[PDB]
């Protein structure tokens, strides 16, 4: 039902080939867009039917540079305009010339903030037919409309049913309804011309009845079907006894609705908001995560791109590589651009070296995205991030991608520790030497139904197979991050530790081991190797069949400790008579 939007504006897609798939994965089946709705650079005959479910956009709606004749957003009721496209525009239709003929925004009755920008769309018929004044909410708005009528198109008059000649298209279903300019009294929204047709003040797009439960959409906030000004506090205050109290009916605020708990990758708070950020003077604490207040001076926080002093920084360079030293968790994104590995004659900044990237060796978690569009030719993989376990994707590239690999010479990913992509899409393309893409259990990394891998122009599977390039034979299900036994996701035999093996050295060998959860762990040094039998049952000196030297009950010992003890005829340590 709920998904996030994108952040491309009029920028070209990295992969025109997968651009349509991207939009589908992001928006298909969504009713609410927690972000901007951007439909740009579309081909003709595009399968846009997946957009039919959208009812609300939290941000702006941008449709640009599309050759499509129609965009199926008939169910769209509100463009809230939290963010606006350019000069305060909530809706922008640009350069759609192929090209749009109808708006078909039948359900669109409200814009809360911003104006409407429709320009250079030389097919569009009804951009100047819609009574935008009615659509704009009662509240003071710029409500600037820029309507380009240079359509160069012979358009049909609105259906006879469209009293007032207001329509979104040539059909009767395209007739525009009016919710404000037809109201009795001072009502912001109505079903009709009578006082009895007035909608509840908390209603936005209109209503089916007078109650706040009858709203088509909520103006301020949706609480489980009821439009209300606020989400019920988690903790309330007794003004008569001066005491705070827990509220059984309290809920968390997520976007514009109540939840019983914050959605995955979102932090809960004591004010009751779901956030992607932990406010200053607080800490992120696991249980499921929440943001807790610092009672004592806050711990060191490592930051990535997009955060703090790195907010305006495009990429990691030799100028800031050192800032990741000693970090396990980076609050922000990472990006490696051509400018990161090349030099900059302007700022006189040195290129990153292979040995400098090692600063990320200790990195386990990225809260943002990982964008790599450049990489040293001396590094056949991304193993410098081999210890990377989680990419949260709280910050997404272009508002969509949490993991992107473009134009790299890497043969395999090698990200063997990577077990979770909390959010966002993955894009791997134009990596003509990269084989181990389809060998990765991506379905095991994704958490949200809206996540998927997009890829193209990577090394052909046929070529990988032809050369015998594949996962290790001991690698379970053939799922691996690379060709080595150390890069496998799971082992069909023993894990050992970081290498698939046939067996542990239990019965044979000097450096004897024991089996523990399919791992191969060493026997205690004081343990005697058993030829043809089990050397030990564990790593402790009291878990061996026999001592390498002699006993110090219950443990094996090399030499007695100094209660000074000595090796007696028993073959064991005993308290000495000499003191």
């Amino acid at each position: 039902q709920v998904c996030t939007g994108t952040d491309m504006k009029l920028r070209l897609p990295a992969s025109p080939e997968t651009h349509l798939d991207m939009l589908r994965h992001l928006y298909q089946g969504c009713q609410v867009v927690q972000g901007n709705l951007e439909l740009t650079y579309l081909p003709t005959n595009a399968s846009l039917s997946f957009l039919q479910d959208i009812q609300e956009v939290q941000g702006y709606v941008l449709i640009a540079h599309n050759q499509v004749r129609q965009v199926p957003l008939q169910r769209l009721r509100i463009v809230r305009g939290t963010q606006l496209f350019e000069d305060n525009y909530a809706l922008a239709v640009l350069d759609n010339g192929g090209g749009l003929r109808e708006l078909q925004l039948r359900s669109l009755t409200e814009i809360l903030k911003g104006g409407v920008l429709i320009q250079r769309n030389p097919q569009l018929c009804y951009q100047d037919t819609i009574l935008w004044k009615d659509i704009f909410h009662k509240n003071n708005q710029l409500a600037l409309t820029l309507i380009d009528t240079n359509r160069s198109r012979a358009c049909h008059p609105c259906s006879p049913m469209c009293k007032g000649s207001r329509c979104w298209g040539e059909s009767s279903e395209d007739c525009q309804s009016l919710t404000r300019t037809v109201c009795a009294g001072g009502c912001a929204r109505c079903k009709g011309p009578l006082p009895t047709d007035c909608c509840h003040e908390q209603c936005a797009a209109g209503c089916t009845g007078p109650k706040h439960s009858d709203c088509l959409a909520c103006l301020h906030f949706n609480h489980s079907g009821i439009c209300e000004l606020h989400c019920p506090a988690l903790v309330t205050y007794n003004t008569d006894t001066f005491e705070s109290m827990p509220n059984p009916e309290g809920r968390y605020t997520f976007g514009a609705s109540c939840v019983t708990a914050c959605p995955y990758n979102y932090l809960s708070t004591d004010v009751g908001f779901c956030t992607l950020v932990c406010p200053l003077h607080n800490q992120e604490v696991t249980a499921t995560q929440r943001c807790e207040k610092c009672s004592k001076p806050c711990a060191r926080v490592c930051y990535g791109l997009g955060m703090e002093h790195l907010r305006e920084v495009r990429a990691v360079t030799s100028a800031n590589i050192q800032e990741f030293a000693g970090c396990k968790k980076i609050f922000g994104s990472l990006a490696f651009l051509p400018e990161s590995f090349d030099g900059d004659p302007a700022s006189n900044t040195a290129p990153l070296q292979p040995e400098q990237l090692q600063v990320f060796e200790t990195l386990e978690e990225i809260t943002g995205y990982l964008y790599i569009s450049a990489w040293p030719d001396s590094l056949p993989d991304l193993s410098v991030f081999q210890n990377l376990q989680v990419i949260r994707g709280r910050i997404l590239h272009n508002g969509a991608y949490s993991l992107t690999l473009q134009g790299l010479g890497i043969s395999w990913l090698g990200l063997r520790s990577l077990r979770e992509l909390g959010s966002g899409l993955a894009l791997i393309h134009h990596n003509t030497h990269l084989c181990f893409v389809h060998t990765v259990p991506w379905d095991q990394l994704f958490r949200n139904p809206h996540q998927a891998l997009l890829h193209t122009a990577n090394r052909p599977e046929d070529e990988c197979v032809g050369e015998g390039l594949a996962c290790h034979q001991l690698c379970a299900r053939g799922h691996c991050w690379g060709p080595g036994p150390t890069q496998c996701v799971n082992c069909s035999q023993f894990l050992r530790g970081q290498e698939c093996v046939e067996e542990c050295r239990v019965l044979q060998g000097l450096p004897r081991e024991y089996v523990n959860a399919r791992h191969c762990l060493p026997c205690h040094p004081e343990c005697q190797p058993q030829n043809g039998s089990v050397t030990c049952f564990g790593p402790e000196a009291d878990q061996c069949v026999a001592c390498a030297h002699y006993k110090d009950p219950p443990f094996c010992v090399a030499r007695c400790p100094s209660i000074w003890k000595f090796p007696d005829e028993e073959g064991a340590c005993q308290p000495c008579p000499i003191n």
């Epitope: 790593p539 402790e540 009291d542 009950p553 219950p554 003890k565 005993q574």
Partner: antibody, heavy 120, light 108 residues
Framework: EVQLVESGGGLVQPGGSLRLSCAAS????????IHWVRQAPGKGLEWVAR????????RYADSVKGRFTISADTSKNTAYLQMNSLRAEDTAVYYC?????????????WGQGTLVTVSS | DIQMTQSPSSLSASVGDRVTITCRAS??????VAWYQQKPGKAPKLLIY???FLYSGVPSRFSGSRSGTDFTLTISSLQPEDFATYYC?????????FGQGTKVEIKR
């Protein structure tokens, strides 16, 4: 001598859990073997589990394997025993003890014990 | 799993009398046996370690010995204060194991 103080006892229902602790003073528990022993009413002593924080290895009695987890916090110098899936037969006084010294492996250090009652 | 059989489970002797408590290991455990004493309302305390050796802080009234798998705890002069349950425990294997336990009554 040393001071050993058990806590965490009280009443828990069957199928629930109870977390025992034992604070130490006079020595660093890190370097010794930490044991828990339990005594059911009318019964003798039953060895339960040990932790050896120096290397973090644990051992359990067959009677508690799969249910009890033993650990210690060397910064708090306090031993802990997490007992899950408790049943009525687990009613006992639980004692903490340590094997003080290097080559000395007998329970010279003892606390007082705390009663754990498991009942609906 | 080394078993320890302790006996007698009940002894009775007058004050000042000599009392011996024994236990038999199912295995030869050398001297890896300790004797513990639990007073009413108290945790078990250590008396004898390494079969025969007296632990510092323990009354000189106690001493032990070993013969094969048979261990003995001996008190040369039984006191009223020695009314407690005694345990024979092996510390040779893991787990450590206890015998049934022995009680000694003061004869009167």
């Amino acid at each position: 001598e040393v001071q050993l103080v058990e806590s965490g006892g009280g009443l828990v229902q069957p199928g629930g859990s109870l977390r025992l602790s034992c604070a130490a003073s006079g020595f660093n528990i890190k370097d010794t073997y930490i044991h828990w022993v339990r005594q059911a009413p009318g019964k003798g002593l039953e060895w339960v589990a040990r932790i050896y924080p120096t290397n973090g290895y644990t051992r359990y009695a067959d009677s508690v394997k799969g249910r009890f987890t033993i650990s210690a916090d060397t910064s708090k110098n306090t031993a802990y025993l997490q007992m899950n899936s408790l049943r009525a037969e687990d009613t006992a006084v639980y004692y903490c003890s340590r094997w003080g010294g290097d080559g000395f492996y007998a329970m010279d250090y003892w606390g007082q014990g705390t009663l754990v009652t498991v009942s609906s | 799993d080394i078993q320890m059989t302790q006996s007698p489970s009940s002894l009775s002797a007058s004050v000042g009398d000599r009392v011996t408590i024994t236990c038999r290991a199912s295995q030869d455990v050398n001297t890896a046996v300790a004797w513990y004493q639990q007073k009413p309302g108290k945790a078990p305390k250590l008396l004898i370690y390494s079969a025969s050796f007296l632990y510092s802080g323990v009354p000189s009234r106690f001493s032990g010995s070993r013969s094969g798998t048979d261990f003995t705890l001996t008190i040369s002069s039984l006191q009223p204060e020695d009314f407690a349950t005694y345990y024979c425990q092996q510390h040779y294997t893991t787990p450590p194991t206890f015998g049934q336990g022995t009680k000694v009554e003061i004869k009167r």
